[PDB]
Symmetry: C5
Subunit: 336 residues, 5 copies
Amino acid sequence: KSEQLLRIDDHDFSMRPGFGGPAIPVGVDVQVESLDSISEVDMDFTMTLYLRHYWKDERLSFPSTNNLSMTFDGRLVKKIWVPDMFFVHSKRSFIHDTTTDNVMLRVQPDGKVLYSLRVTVTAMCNMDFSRFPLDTQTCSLEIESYAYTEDDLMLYWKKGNDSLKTDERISLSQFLIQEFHTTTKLAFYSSTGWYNRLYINFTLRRHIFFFLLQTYFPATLMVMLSWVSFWIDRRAVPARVPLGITTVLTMSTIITGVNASMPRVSYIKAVDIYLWVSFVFVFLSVLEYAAVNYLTTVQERKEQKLRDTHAIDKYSRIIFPAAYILFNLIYWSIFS
Amino acid sequence: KSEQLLRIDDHDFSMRPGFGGPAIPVGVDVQVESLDSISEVDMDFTMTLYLRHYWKDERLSFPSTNNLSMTFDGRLVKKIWVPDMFFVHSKRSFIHDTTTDNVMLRVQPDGKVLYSLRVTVTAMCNMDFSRFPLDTQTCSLEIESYAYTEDDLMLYWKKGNDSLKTDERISLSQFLIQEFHTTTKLAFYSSTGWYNRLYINFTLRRHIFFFLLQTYFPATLMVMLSWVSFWIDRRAVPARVPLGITTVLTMSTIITGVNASMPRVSYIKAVDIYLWVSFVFVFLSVLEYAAVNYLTTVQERKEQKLRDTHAIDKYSRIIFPAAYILFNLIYWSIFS
Amino acid sequence: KSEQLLRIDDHDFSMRPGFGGPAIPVGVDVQVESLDSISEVDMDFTMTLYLRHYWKDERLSFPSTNNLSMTFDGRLVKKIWVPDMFFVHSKRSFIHDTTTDNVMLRVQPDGKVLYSLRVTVTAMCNMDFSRFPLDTQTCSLEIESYAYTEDDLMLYWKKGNDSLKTDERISLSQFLIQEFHTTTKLAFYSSTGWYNRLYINFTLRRHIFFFLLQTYFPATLMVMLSWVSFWIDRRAVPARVPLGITTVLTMSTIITGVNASMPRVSYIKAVDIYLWVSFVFVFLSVLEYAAVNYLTTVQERKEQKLRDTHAIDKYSRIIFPAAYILFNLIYWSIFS
Amino acid sequence: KSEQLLRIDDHDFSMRPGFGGPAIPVGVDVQVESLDSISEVDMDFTMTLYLRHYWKDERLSFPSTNNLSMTFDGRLVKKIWVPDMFFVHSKRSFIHDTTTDNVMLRVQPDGKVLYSLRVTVTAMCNMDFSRFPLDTQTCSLEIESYAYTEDDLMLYWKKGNDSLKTDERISLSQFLIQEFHTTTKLAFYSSTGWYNRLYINFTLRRHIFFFLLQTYFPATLMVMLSWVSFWIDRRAVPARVPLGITTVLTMSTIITGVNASMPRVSYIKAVDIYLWVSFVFVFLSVLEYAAVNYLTTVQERKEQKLRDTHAIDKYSRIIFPAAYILFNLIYWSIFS
Amino acid sequence: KSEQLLRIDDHDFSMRPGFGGPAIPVGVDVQVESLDSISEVDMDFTMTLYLRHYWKDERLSFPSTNNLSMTFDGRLVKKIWVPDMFFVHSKRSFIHDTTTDNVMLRVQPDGKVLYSLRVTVTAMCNMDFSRFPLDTQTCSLEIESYAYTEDDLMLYWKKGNDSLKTDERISLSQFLIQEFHTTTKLAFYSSTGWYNRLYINFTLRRHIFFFLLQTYFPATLMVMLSWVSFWIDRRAVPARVPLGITTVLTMSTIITGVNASMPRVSYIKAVDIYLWVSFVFVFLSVLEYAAVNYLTTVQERKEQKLRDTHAIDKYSRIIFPAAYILFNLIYWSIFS
Ligand SMILES: CCCCCCCCC(=O)O[C@H](COC(=O)CCCCCC)COP(=O)(O)O
Ligand SMILES: CCCCCCCCC(=O)O[C@H](COC(=O)CCCCCC)COP(=O)(O)O
Ligand SMILES: CCCCCCCCC(=O)O[C@H](COC(=O)CCCCCC)COP(=O)(O)O
Ligand SMILES: CCCCCCCCC(=O)O[C@H](COC(=O)CCCCCC)COP(=O)(O)O
Ligand SMILES: CCCCCCCCC(=O)O[C@H](COC(=O)CCCCCC)COP(=O)(O)O
Ligand SMILES: CCCCCCCCC(=O)O[C@H](COC(=O)CCCCCC)COP(=O)(O)O
Ligand SMILES: CCCCCCCCC(=O)O[C@H](COC(=O)CCCCCC)COP(=O)(O)O
Ligand SMILES: CCCCCCCCC(=O)O[C@H](COC(=O)CCCCCC)COP(=O)(O)O
Ligand SMILES: *[C@@H]1O[C@H](CO)[C@@H](O)[C@H](O)[C@H]1NC(C)=O
Ligand SMILES: *[C@@H]1O[C@H](CO)[C@@H](O)[C@H](O)[C@H]1NC(C)=O
Ligand SMILES: *[C@@H]1O[C@H](CO)[C@@H](O)[C@H](O)[C@H]1NC(C)=O
Ligand SMILES: *[C@@H]1O[C@H](CO)[C@@H](O)[C@H](O)[C@H]1NC(C)=O
Ligand SMILES: *[C@@H]1O[C@H](CO)[C@@H](O)[C@H](O)[C@H]1NC(C)=O
Ligand SMILES: *[C@@H]1O[C@H](CO)[C@@H](O)[C@H](O)[C@H]1NC(C)=O
Ligand SMILES: *[C@@H]1O[C@H](CO)[C@@H](O)[C@H](O)[C@H]1NC(C)=O
Ligand SMILES: *[C@@H]1O[C@H](CO)[C@@H](O)[C@H](O)[C@H]1NC(C)=O
Ligand SMILES: *[C@@H]1O[C@H](CO)[C@@H](O)[C@H](O)[C@H]1NC(C)=O
Ligand SMILES: *[C@@H]1O[C@H](CO)[C@@H](O)[C@H](O)[C@H]1NC(C)=O
Ligand SMILES: [Cl-]
Ligand SMILES: [Cl-]
């Protein structure tokens, strides 16, 4: 029996190696397989990865006439000591078990142990949508020991920045993934003390041109279309009035459709500012012709009682485009 | 073997410590890690937290030449007595088990025991949306012993109000979280008797300006736009009629879009009152010109058979804005 | 050891108490904690409740010098006999297990046993939406023994109608819950014989005024608005025609929005009848002016070749409101 | 002990009864409790049912002084041989376990065994929506032995067509269920050989009148409304043009709303053909007046340079309704 | 006992057959039962299949007087060595267990072993929607040994390209499935070394005519309808202006409805290019009449101060259709 080469019953496997002495170093290597999905409303993402641990235990040394190693499955985990790593700020996770548990153990003759498992984890990531759709989001994944402090277990990246590997075909449907790197930081808990924590960082970006074409283009086109009425004769009321009211209706429908296709985030974003400024512009373009018509009627009635182009249109033709251009300059300087 | 230092087989671990005597005090400390999501339709929220228990058991005392403690994992839980806390008014919950069970046990030489576990719980919270979107909701989380009454187990916060800690980056997408505090209350069950219950309370608020801009602004703009027709000559029927009917259509589309983006709550809210009052105003603005046109036609026909501005417009120009301002004053005094 | 006071190994616990003799009575008490959700499309509801069983077993009697009882957790269930209750016409259910199994056992010195557990169950409930939104739905929850007939196990409510308790704050977002009561009925299975079944009944109702305001008000307003054209001069075709066609468009949009916000139930309801009758009314209001215009053109052409208000408008002004009022009377007499 | 009456340890229960001889007959009875839901997009349905097996085993015979039987729960399944039935072409299934496993075993003194369990199963069902909403779908449920061929296990319906029972109140929200019957067929696998398979068949139908009223009625009404313009004077351009363009807009909105409420099936159906033919009709009704207006302008200009009803309208008034009636006749003859 | 014919306790089943010598060949056969669903947003698909393994082990040989084999269920798996196959780039998977585990083992007298199980797996598949709806997607399923390299376990298709079988009625609601074939490729891992990987490839296609009719037809019809105004007299402003603005509104509504029914993929596709070019065309058709009207007014005013068809319309009638035809030619040459 292979388990009789390792004196399992001659040692206590409820304690860490080197109990009572210096802490044992444990190295961690991570390979990212894929990113499953990302949820903006709940602010989380799902990742599938390989987790590997490296440590040495003299109690597992066995004699041999060569340098061959022994490989064991997940059934030997319950009989030996293994590190109790867990993912910080996670919501749910599981280990794949088809067609059997995806756990592997390799033991060297001198006691070096490799422990590898395949896991899927969902972790939280706070996001800020104030600059949507020009926002940038940075999410991280954290790994920490649960019950062992820095005095008993020392956690580190085995090969520094080379310990993280990513798949060549990792991608997201609506996001761009970039800038993968690893960092470490010490965390303190008042109940037990200090812990070592490992981080995996990456950055997310959107496709700007899609949102520009879908949102900013129709609003600008409708605003420029609302300026057509300034070049129409003031005497054609049944042409000036329906044009303005239908432009208002079209802008309202465009705004509603754009809102219906965005994530349900309940605070003001830049796109909302742009759309409502456009709506205000169309509203003012309607009030302008209302005032022109009233003044024309008053003047005609006064002339009849006593017995060309209106200046308001001339000034509006210059003022409205200049105001819109100034607003666009300020907006795109603020939001880059 | 570490388990041979504790005389497990020499004691009965099916009974609580101090059986037959005074009740044993048990202290509870809670650290809130994050709030996962909140559902308005089903009236529940999801929270992830750390739960810690403190109690003393003389049966676990072991001799030692120093003051070092022993740490055990979840496998020792089944061999000793642990408190049976459960969450009241919960719908579903689970304990994380990646890469292993997130359960820790620490035993002091004098018998003091610390029992900590990481859990995710979904709990109910009744909500009232009558004052939406100016509503305020208070939700709580309750912890109680399942099988032990106050005569056998005494439950309390270990350090009073300092026993609750919250993460610095806890937030919700569409809500503001504030006013975390802890309270206790005794509960009675006729089947068994009195129990001690612990509470964790917090308050939720919305973003008012977003809803104001998205809902109240377009309705007010459309109502003010409907008053433009009072300044147009009564003789231009093909300009007065289409303007009113298109304003009605635009208001209807705005109301439908607003309803489509709100939670499916089937009772009357303040926003509905505002929108339908606006719809009634636009309807009356159409009936007014209908009456003016009919009266003008009647007068002209009578004059022809026998062979300026209509007073209704003059009175409407004053009455409609005054009525709308009065309605807004009353509404915003009632709903603050 | 507490389990050595009960002669577990001296008795066979695979058979019911009193085997070979009269059936053993078993009492059931239910406390409803909350209603989680209700699904109209799938016709089911979710409930969380406490289930308690009472029975006597002489094999569990133990000597004592006082009248104290012993409390055991879920681990003793597998060593003794317990009733095998199950929920009839259920889809899915589970027993909560955080932080441990929510199962309690209390044994009296004379052999009386109390068995309590906390369970969540999803059960079917057939619904009829013909009278929507004025429909009333009655749902029930059923409890029955699985393997024991009335000859071996007699099931009953322990305290009659007092055996059902409900939480003070039980509520639903879009429904009103009322009339909780308990009933019993005998059921027959040809494979095994008769069984005793217990019922928990309740009634659901909606909020009428919300649906009235959201649906019936806009349709009536649009129908009344379509009657405005009968008071406009027949000579203003560019005012009569666009008004009618835009009214038809507005009614169509209102009907589509109302349909988009209702549950996806694929058969005719009362609200559909109301909306389509309104649509037919607006259609006829357009055909009426078409006929008036054609007749006016024919008369003018005939007069020119040979070389006031049209009666159709006068009759329509009376006929249309009277027909609509009669339809409303009949509809609200049929649907109350 | 009841298990000592059956010589469990004196026989090998890893082999089927009658090993090495003729195959053992096994009878199956099924009672359908309810249909939970049906998914058109994923093409599957969910059913809850009772499954019963009948077979004889001489190794379970026990002496008795009467004719009473012994009932055992799910714990005896692991100690005896039971048939390994499974559902073919299923996606997911489970056995209910509240408050315990819903498994029953009854053993007669002569060795007859009844094995009953309650199960919920989701099975695939290919559907064809070409004739939607006049389509008819037939779904089936299949039961087969997993590891035993016809040479070792003979599977059949115990009582022929009487072995299937259905609940009196089984129904679906949007479907009609009818024609339940049972059939058998032999299946061949090249790896192992022939198997016996059992079928449960039923048919699904929709509610025709609901879809007719919701879809075909508005399209026909709009098409008939588009013919009104042929009776209006050609000299009223501001009445002819807006009517046609608004009719086109209304038809487009109706088509979009109808598409938004149908299942997301990506191929052409009959309703799409009807709606797009109607759209083409309205388009042609607009081109007709465009041509009439151009011809009238040309004629007037020619007459002025040189110095009644247009025939196109007269022919259109007859041609358009006749063409639409012919199309409806052909369509309803093809699609019945 | 059947398990006593196989000397289970006389051999170590923790090591592979032929340990220390040449690698053991293992053959794999796959039968695809159905495709459950496909998700475009998350880029994955679900498949149900049968997995079979073939290998020889001399340690399982048993004496017999004939050539009959022994069949064992899933309970023997834990006592013998079985290959540890797993699915690469999968997200979740499970093995069906109703009414029992769907695992079968057949052992020949000479030691040949057949191991078959029924599994459901969800796997990732990167997709590109740039050419939507004319895109073609190729997805694959990968099988690899977890812990054994090519030096210890040699994995191959048992019968080459005949080892893959597919159901006759496999289909998808919105996709066409074709070109099933099998390939192999060697993969390298720096931690352990080389592995053998098996592939199952297939291709997906859409229904072109449905998307054409739903999207390209209405846009072309609206663009052609916008050219009607070039044939209308320039003196009818209340007919030219509302037609153009309503055409713009109709195009906007069509674009919004089309966007609302497509998968939420956030980058530019071909259909978007087509729709926005059409929108630009309608915008230019409105600017053209604006310019014509302004020029006509200027000319009339100049003539009055001093005291036929406009050329712009004549040139537009030719230029606009030619430009649209050229754009369609270029677009359909680029996108085929
Ligand atoms: C947005 C709607 C503005 C309403 C018109 C403002 C009332 C001023 C008015 O009518 O008095 C005008 C004064 O004209 C101007 O002030 C020219 C500047 C135009 C500003 C418009 C951008 C009376 O006209 P008149 O005495 O003939 O010059
Ligand atoms: C909302 C629609 C109201 C319909 C018009 C009311 C009919 C009264 C009418 O026409 O008689 C009017 C009386 O005018 C008034 O009462 C002035 C007050 C205006 C109230 C309007 C806010 C007849 O006109 P006249 O005899 O010339 O003054
Ligand atoms: C105008 C002054 C402000 C009104 C305050 C409304 C408070 C009344 C209230 O909250 O009880 C409301 C009733 O609301 C209304 O009466 C709607 C009025 C319709 C207006 C447009 C047609 C309770 O109704 P409900 O919860 O559905 O039982
Ligand atoms: C819904 C559309 C009805 C179309 C008009 C009906 C054609 C009858 C017609 O034009 O002949 C009319 C007869 O008028 C009437 O019958 C008065 C009753 C009005 C009924 C309308 C509710 C011819 O007009 P005349 O000979 O001048 O009276
Ligand atoms: C769908 C739009 C059809 C455009 C008009 C067709 C051009 C033919 C034309 O204008 O020449 C017409 C010929 O009229 C006809 O052909 C009568 C049949 C009407 C067919 C309409 C259904 C010229 O008018 P005229 O020489 O006065 O008869
Ligand atoms: C008018 C007479 C009735 C037509 C019967 C259509 C049967 C043809 C059929 O089912 O094959 C259909 C083709 O349908 C059409 O041709 C649509 C015509 C467009 C009309 C409006 C533009 C098969 O198409 P598909 O399943 O997408 O491959
Ligand atoms: C898309 C909107 C184009 C605006 C009109 C362009 C201004 C040019 C203008 O008005 O000067 C025109 C010149 O006409 C032309 O250039 C004929 C070509 C028409 C090109 C239109 C496709 C002045 O008119 P006229 O001196 O009488 O010829
Ligand atoms: C007219 C001739 C056909 C155009 C072929 C477009 C191919 C270019 C391409 O695929 O790269 C596209 C760019 O598409 C456009 O330029 C949109 C043009 C807007 C037109 C309406 C405003 C890549 O863009 P993206 O994936 O978002 O980085
Ligand atoms: C390799 O194994 C041989 C035994 O076969 C041993 O003598 C030698 O020292 C080993 N070398 C290393 C580097 O482990
Ligand atoms: C790892 O590489 C990243 C790449 O930017 C760098 O920021 C980081 O400092 C590096 N860390 C170490 C420990 O080398
Ligand atoms: C600490 O441990 C020492 C033994 O090393 C013991 O003598 C001393 O009393 C302990 N002190 C406390 C406060 O426990
Ligand atoms: C805890 O602090 C909260 C803060 O408002 C207070 O309301 C509550 O009374 C305090 N309770 C105790 C026990 O101090
Ligand atoms: C209560 O317990 C006492 C023993 O302490 C016993 O003598 C007495 O009979 C009991 N009474 C009842 C009602 O059980
Ligand atoms: C229980 O109370 C309800 C209340 O209406 C009543 O209908 C029912 O008959 C009662 N049943 C019994 C057994 O008292
Ligand atoms: C019924 O049981 C009696 C014993 O009580 C036995 O004598 C008789 O044969 C049995 N009959 C049948 C039909 O099993
Ligand atoms: C069972 O009844 C159905 C009812 O139509 C029939 O079609 C079928 O042939 C019958 N089968 C047998 C075996 O009687
Ligand atoms: C078949 O079995 C017989 C024993 O019944 C044996 O003699 C013969 O060799 C076997 N043949 C093969 C091909 O295994
Ligand atoms: C299997 O058949 C496919 C069919 O196209 C072919 O492409 C492939 O090369 C074949 N592979 C082998 C190993 O025959
Ligand atoms: Cl006009
Ligand atoms: Cl619209």
